[PDB]
Paper text:
Corticosteroid-binding globulin (CBG) is a glycosylated plasma protein implicated in steroid transport and delivery. By its primary structure, CBG is classified as a clade A member of the serine protease inhibitor (SERPIN) family, together with the closely related alpha-1-antichymotrypsin, alpha-1-antitrypsin (AAT) and thyroxine-binding globulin (TBG). Contrary to the proteinase inhibitors alpha-1-antichymotrypsin and AAT, CBG and TBG have no known inhibitory function. While CBG does not act as a protease inhibitor, it is a substrate for neutrophil elastase and becomes cleaved in the reactive center loop (RCL).
It represents the first crystal structure of CBG in complex with progesterone and, more importantly, the sequence of the RCL corresponds to that of wild-type CBG and is not replaced by the sequence of AAT Pittsburgh as in a previous study with a CBG-AAT chimera. Second, the RCL was cleaved during crystallization, and upon structure solution it became obvious that CBG is depicted in the SERPIN R-conformation with a fully antiparallel six-stranded β-sheet A, in which the RCL is integrated as β-strand s4 into sheet A. The RCL is cleaved after Thr349 or Ser350. If cleavage occurred after Thr349, the cleavage site would be homologous to that of human AAT after cleavage with neutrophil elastase. As a result of this novel cleavage site, the inserted RCL segment is four residues longer than expected, and a more extended β-strand s4 is formed with additional main-chain hydrogen bonds with neighboring strands s3 and s5. From a structural point of view, this novel cleavage site makes sense because it allows for the formation of an extended β-strand s4A with main-chain hydrogen-bonds connecting the former RCL segment to strands s5A and s3A over the entire length of β-sheet A. The stacking of the indol ring of Trp371 against the cyclohexane ring of progesterone constitutes a hallmark for ligand binding to CBG. Trp371 itself packs via a cation-π-interaction with Arg15. Only a single direct hydrogen bond is formed between progesterone and CBG, namely between the carbonyl oxygen at C-20 and the side chain of Gln232. Our structural data suggest that this difference can be attributed to the fact that progesterone does not form some of the hydrogen bonds observed in the cortisol complex because it lacks the hydroxyl groups attached to atoms C-11 and C-17.
Numbering used by the authors:
A (entry chain A): 13 to 95, 101 to 349
B (entry chain B): 351 to 383
Amino acid sequence: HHRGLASANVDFAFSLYKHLVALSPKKNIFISPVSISMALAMLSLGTCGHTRAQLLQGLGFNLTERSETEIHQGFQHLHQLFALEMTMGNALFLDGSLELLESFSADIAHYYESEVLAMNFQDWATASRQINSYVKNKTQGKIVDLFSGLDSPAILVLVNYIFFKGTWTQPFDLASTREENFYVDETTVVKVPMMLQSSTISYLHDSELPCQLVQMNYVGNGTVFFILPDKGKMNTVIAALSRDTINRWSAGLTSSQVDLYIPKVTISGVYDLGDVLEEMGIADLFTNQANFSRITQDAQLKSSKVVHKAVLQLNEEGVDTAGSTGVTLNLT
Amino acid sequence: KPIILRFNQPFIIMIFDHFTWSSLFLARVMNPV
Ligand SMILES: CC(=O)[C@H]1CC[C@H]2[C@@H]3CCC4=CC(=O)CC[C@]4(C)[C@H]3CC[C@]12C
């Protein structure tokens, strides 16, 4: 099954991004929304009551028009489709002192194909290093140090990872790459390796918004939008981001002769998404009132942390990207 | 006459799976290095 939760996940994606952007004036942002969605959807498998309803709604789902089951099947079909190169996976790291409910184990296996790995969380230093090692392998070395030792303890950790390697259908010219000015703002200018290609490219000078954009494919199914807002107009353009805007852009894009200069990009985001998720309505999950009563029988759990790490390497051949989302739970 | 497009100021990257329409990656590039 292909597109059933596209609308919800992409709404969540844009929303999260907009909230992340408003909480950071001058920094690079890079996130994998699908990883966050999958991580939180899996987590909801252990939730009940107000906790459950609030989380699924914050993830973009209308619970009066689609059941919890339908949502989880959608994430299952997503996972199957992903798992030149794309991989996506889920793991559950568990303390020996925690007996999971069978139906919960059944669900994470059925819908999310989660690995279940029994660790000892009494020594957070070793546990976190082990989990980190796991994420590093699964992302082929791209995501290191997802968890700190600085972090609180945990009794249970849920992890999603994503890795993606795309090859431009239209690579940039290696002989044309050179140092050029990158204007960070009016006053700040840096030197960056700037790629060039001269070719037929999908281009649109937007008449409704202060921006130009191009669209580019990867070999296979991947595609990418590069959007250049006018000087100082970044937040205007960001506010307009929506499925509808992408649809309007997609209708406006025309094959054109373009001298296309795009810098080599190497950026990486590290987020504690707690605050942002609360701004998005997802709140009870982080409190003592959290209902995690589908996970185990006789322990009261809450979420302490939702962490996200993503890395982007962009060059003349394509894109090397990875992402990973961790949720720690401990006894309230 | 070719359109000259220079991404030498803050810009947005959006990566999608054309098949499922998933938002795979979202970037705000303020400083690419
Ligand atoms: C035809 C095409 O290039 C595809 C690639 C990515 C696709 C979009 C991905 C996001 C998306 C999610 C939706 O639920 C509505 C349609 C849209 C807005 C898609 C419209 C068609 C697009 C633009």
